[PDB]
C-alpha cells in the first residue's frame, strides 16, 4: 500500500492511503529522503487518512510525498549483537561501527506480561550506598526509581549504581538514554569502554546502548524508552539471563507525549499533560518487570518538574516502583551527597522479615531521630536553643551527625566531591549507624562523619581532625 | 508619539514626552484582541503583547537627529509587577521608578522602593564614585534591614545585636530622609514643596551613614528637604 | 528583684510575641487561600483555552 503526505505540522504528519489503510502502531517509510524517516501510525482520522508521529524531522517533507507501509510496527535488532553497539530509536547503528548483524529483530510495541507471570521473590541488592542500603535497599529484580529535580544527583547516582552493579553483574545490561544530554551519552560510552564494559574489539561487551537525546524530535524521545526496553526484554525471556535496565530520563517519555498531544487533537488534562498519561505510562512500565522467565533489575531516573512531586508525571510514576529514592535539593544544597531524603525514600523489602529485624530497627531508628530533629528545627527556628532538655540537645547532635554520615563520596562525582570514591558494605553501614544511635561516637565532631566511608574512616578522621 | 517624533527630528528640539498611562495601551489591546479572533495568551492578554509594545516603545527613543526624554506612567494591575504588562515594559526603560503601595501606606512619599528602582546611569565613571558609593551604601543598609524585619516582626527588636540595632536605627532615618514633600501634593503632605540639589542629597545620606546623626529622632527626617531641615526639625521637636 | 523583673518582661514579651505570631498566621492563611484559588483558576483557564483551539 502507498500513501501520500497531505498535511505536515510539527512532528505530526497525516498520510492518505489510496488502498489498504495501515493499522495503528505500524511504521511507515517516508520515500524520498536521504535520511530514513519513519512515521508511526497513531490515529485513523478517517477518509482513508491516518495521523502519524515522526520519529525524526519532518523538515523538507512535501505534501504528496509517497510513503510506504512497512506492514509492521517499528522493529529493532535484538540479541548479543547489540551489546557494545549504540542503537538508534529505530534500531539503526549510530555508533559508526557498521550495521548490527542480528539474525532476528523484535517489535518495540508488545503486550505486558500476564498476572500469572509475575514473581514474589524479594532479595536485597547491596548497591554499596549507605543511605540506600540502610533505609531504602533495592531488590534484585525489582523496579527502582530515582526521583529528583534539575540538579540533585539523579544522573550521577544512576552512573554510580552502574559502576558498582553493572560492572560486577553476571549477565547483560541495557542503557536507554531518553531525552537527555548527548554529552552524557558520549561520556558514558567512553567511560564504559575504559572500564571494559564495552569492548570495541572482542565480544565481551555486556552493556547495550540505545539513545534519543534532547536533540531528537518528540516522536523519537517517546519511543527510545520502548526501544531500550525491548532490548532488555529479549535478554530476559529468550535467554533467561539477569538483565539490568537503566533508563535516564524516563520522564522524557511523558514530556514527549505532552508535546505532540495538542497536535494529536487531545484536550489538555491536569497541568496540561495529555489525558492518556497514566495509561501510556502503564502500557510501557508494565513491560519493564521481572517474569518467571527472567529477572530485570530496572533503575529509572525520574525527573520532577519544578521539584513539584505532585506533578502528574512523577506522581503517577511512584506506583510503578518497588524502591523509591527521592532526591531533595535542600539536602543537596546543604552539601550532603547523595542528596537522598531519608524521610521520603522507601523500599518494599524494608520488612523486618526480609532485611532482618536488626536492619529494620536501625533504619527506623535513624529515620525517627531525623524526623524528631526536623520537628525540633522549626521549634527553635527563631527561639534561641538553650531550653531543650539533655535528650533534645542529644538527639539534635546525633541526628546531625547521622545526617552528615549519610553523605558518601561517589567515585563518579570525584570531580565534584574532590575526594576519593568510597563504598561501604551493608554490614558496616548498619554497624556504624547502630553505634551512632547507641551514642558510642558522641565524642566526635559532626564533620568527622561528613563525607566519609566506614565508621572507621569517621573515627580515624576525628583523631586526624586534631586541629 | 508621532507629535513628539516631529519636533525631535524635523526640528531637533529636545522633546519631553510624558505619557499617562502607557499601560492602558496594552489593556486596550486585550479588549480588542479577543474580538480580533486571536487565541488568548497568558492571563488572557493578546498573544502579540510583546511585539505591539515593541514597535511602539522603539519609536519613543532618542535618535542621533534628536533627543526625547520620555516619562511614561505604568499602571501595575492588582499590584502584580510580574503581570505580562509591566514585566514586558521594564526592558524598555533606562530608569525605572517602582512605587510601592506598602511604602505609601507607611506615609513615605514619594513611595519609591529604593531596592527595586534601577537606572543604567548608576556607574562610578558616570555619576561619580562619591555618588555611587553613597547610593550603594544606602541601598545596602536598607537591604540589611529587610532581612532583620523578619525576626523583628516576631521577637521584636529586643533579640538584636547592638550592631543590628544601629543598622535598624540608621536605616529608618535614611528610609524617612528619602521621603520628600511634593508641591503637587502639598494638600496632603501639609508641607511646602521642597527641592533638593544632588550635591545636598549625596551629602545628606553620607552624614547619616557616617552616623553623624545617631541621636536625632527619625521623624526629624520625615517630609524634609535638605538634611539641614532634618536637624532644624529635630531642634524644634527637642 | 531580678527574678521578678525577668519574669515580668518575659511574660509581656511572649504575650505580645504569640499575638504577633497569630496575626502573621491569619495573614498567611489569607494569602494562602488567594494563591489556592488563583492556582485552580489558572490551570482551569489553561485547560479551557487548550481545548477551545482544536
Amino acid at each position: 500500500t502507498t500513501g501520500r503526505i497531505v498535511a505536515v505540522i510539527g512532528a505530526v504528519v497525516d498520510v492518505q492511503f489510496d488502498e489498504g489503510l495501515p493499522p495503528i502502531l505500524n511504521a511507515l517509510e517516508v520515500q524520498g529522503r536521504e535520511t530514513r524517516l519513519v512515521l508511526e501510525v497513531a490515529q485513523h482520522l478517517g477518509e482513508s487518512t491516518v495521523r502519524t508521529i515522526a520519529m525524526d524531522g519532518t523538515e523538507g517533507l512535501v505534501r504528496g510525498q509517497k510513503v510506504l507501509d512497512s506492514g509492521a510496527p517499528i522493529r529493532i535488532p535484538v540479541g548479543p549483537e547489540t551489546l557494545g553497539r549504540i542503537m538508534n530509536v529505530i534500531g539503526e547503528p549510530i555508533d559508526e561501527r557498521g550495521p548490527i548483524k542480528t539474525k532476528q529483530f523484535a517489535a518495540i510495541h508488545a503486550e505486558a506480561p500476564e498476572f500469572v507471570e509475575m514473581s514474589v521473590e524479594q532479595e536485597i541488592l547491596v548497591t554499596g550506598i549507605k543511605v540506600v542500603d540502610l533505609l531504602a535497599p533495592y531488590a534484585k529484580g525489582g523496579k527502582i526509581g530515582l526521583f529528583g529535580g534539575a540538579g540533585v544527583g539523579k544522573t550521577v547516582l544512576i552512573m554510580e549504581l552502574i559502576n558498582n552493579v553493572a560492572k560486577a553483574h553476571g549477565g547483560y545490561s541495557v542503557f536507554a538514554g531518553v531525552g537527555e544530554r548527548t554529552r552524557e551519552g558520549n561520556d558514558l560510552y567512553h567511560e564504559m569502554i575504559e572500564s571494559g564494559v564495552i569492548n570495541l574489539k572482542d565480544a565481551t561487551s555486556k552493556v547495550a546502548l540505545v539513545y534519543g537525546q534532547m536533540n531528537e524530535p518528540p516522536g523519537a524521545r517517546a519511543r527510545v524508552a520502548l526501544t531500550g526496553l525491548t532490548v532488555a526484554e529479549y535478554f530476559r525471556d529468550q535467554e533467561g539471563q539477569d538483565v539490568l535496565l537503566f533508563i535516564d530520563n524516563i520522564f522524557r517519555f511523558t514530556q514527549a507525549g505532552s508535546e505532540v498531544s495538542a497536535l494529536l487533537g487531545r484536550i489538555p488534562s491536569a497541568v496540561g499533560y495529555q489525558p492518556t498519561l497514566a495509561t501510556d505510562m502503564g502500557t510501557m512500565q508494565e513491560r519493564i518487570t521481572t517474569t518467571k522467565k527472567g529477572s530485570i533489575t530496572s533503575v529509572q531516573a525520574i525527573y520532577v518538574p519544578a521539584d513539584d512531586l505532585t506533578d502528574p508525571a512523577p506522581a503517577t510514576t511512584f506506583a510503578h516502583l518497588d524502591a523509591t529514592t527521592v532526591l531533595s535539593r535542600a539536602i543537596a544544597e546543604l552539601g550532603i551527597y547523595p542528596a537522598v531524603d531519608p524521610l521520603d525514600s522507601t523500599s518494599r523489602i524494608m520488612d523486618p522479615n526480609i532485611v532482618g529485624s536488626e536492619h529494620y530497627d536501625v533504619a527506623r531508628g535513624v529515620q525517627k531521630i531525623l524526623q524528631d530533629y526536623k520537628s525540633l528545627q522549626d521549634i527553635i527556628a527563631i527561639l534561641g536553643m538553650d531550653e531543650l532538655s539533655e535528650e533534645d540537645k542529644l538527639t539534635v547532635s546525633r541526628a546531625r551527625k547521622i545526617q552528615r554520615f549519610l553523605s558518601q563520596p561517589f567515585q563518579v562525582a570525584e570531580v565534584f566531591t574532590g575526594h576519593l570514591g568510597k563504598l561501604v558494605p551493608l554490614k558496616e553501614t548498619i554497624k556504624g549507624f547502630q553505634q551512632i544511635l547507641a551514642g558510642e561516637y558522641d565524642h566526635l565532631p559532626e564533620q568527622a562523619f561528613y563525607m566519609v566511608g566506614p565508621i572507621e574512616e569517621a573515627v580515624a578522621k576525628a583523631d586526624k581532625l586534631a586541629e | 508619539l508621532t507629535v513628539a517624533e516631529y519636533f525631535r527630528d524635523q526640528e531637533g528640539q529636545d522633546v519631553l514626552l510624558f505619557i499617562d498611562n502607557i499601560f492602558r495601551f496594552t489593556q486596550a489591546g486585550s479588549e480588542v484582541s479577543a474580538l480580533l479572533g486571536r487565541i488568548p495568551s497568558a492571563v488572557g492578554y493578546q498573544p502579540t503583547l510583546a511585539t505591539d509594545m515593541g514597535t511602539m516603545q522603539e519609536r519613543i527613543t532618542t535618535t542621533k537627529k534628536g533627543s526625547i526624554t520620555s516619562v511614561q506612567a505604568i499602571y501595575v494591575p492588582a499590584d502584580d509587577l510580574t503581570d505580562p504588562a509591566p514585566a514586558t515594559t521594564f526592558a524598555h526603560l533606562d530608569a525605572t521608578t517602582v512605587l510601592s503601595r506598602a511604602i505609601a501606606e507607611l506615609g513615605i512619599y514619594p513611595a519609591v522602593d529604593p531596592l527595586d528602582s534601577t537606572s543604567r546611569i548608576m556607574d562610578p565613571n558616570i555619576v561619580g564614585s562619591e555618588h555611587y558609593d553613597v547610593a550603594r551604601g544606602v541601598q545596602k543598609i536598607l537591604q540589611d534591614y529587610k532581612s532583620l524585619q523578619d525576626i523583628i516582626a516576631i521577637l521584636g527588636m529586643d533579640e538584636l545585636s547592638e550592631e543590628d540595632k544601629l543598622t535598624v536605627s540608621r536605616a529608618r532615618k535614611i528610609q524617612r530622609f528619602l521621603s520628600q514633600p511634593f508641591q503637587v501634593a502639598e494638600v496632603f503632605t501639609g508641607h511646602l514643596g521642597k527641592l533638593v540639589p544632588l550635591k545636598e542629597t549625596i551629602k545628606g545620606f553620607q552624614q547619616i551613614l557616617a552616623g553623624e546623626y545617631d541621636h536625632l529622632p527619625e521623624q526629624a527626617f520625615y517630609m524634609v528637604g535638605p538634611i539641614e531641615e532634618a536637624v532644624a526639625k529635630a531642634d524644634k521637636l527637642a | 528583684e531580678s527574678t521578678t523583673s525577668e519574669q515580668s518582661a518575659r511574660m509581656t514579651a511572649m504575650d505580645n510575641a504569640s499575638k504577633n505570631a497569630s496575626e502573621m498566621i491569619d495573614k498567611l492563611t489569607l494569602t494562602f487561600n488567594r494563591t489556592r484559588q488563583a492556582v485552580i483558576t489558572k490551570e482551569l483557564i489553561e485547560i479551557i483555552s487548550g481545548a477551545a483551539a482544536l
Binding site: - | 521577637l155 | 525577668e6 515580668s8 518582661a9 509581656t12 514579651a13 510575641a17
Partner: peptide
C-alpha cells in the same frame, strides 16, 4: 528572650 532586661542593665553595668 526576656524582654529588655539584660541589654538595659548591660548598658549601665559596663
Amino acid at each position: 528572650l526576656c524582654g529588655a532586661i539584660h541589654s538595659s542593665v548591660a548598658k549601665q553595668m559596663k
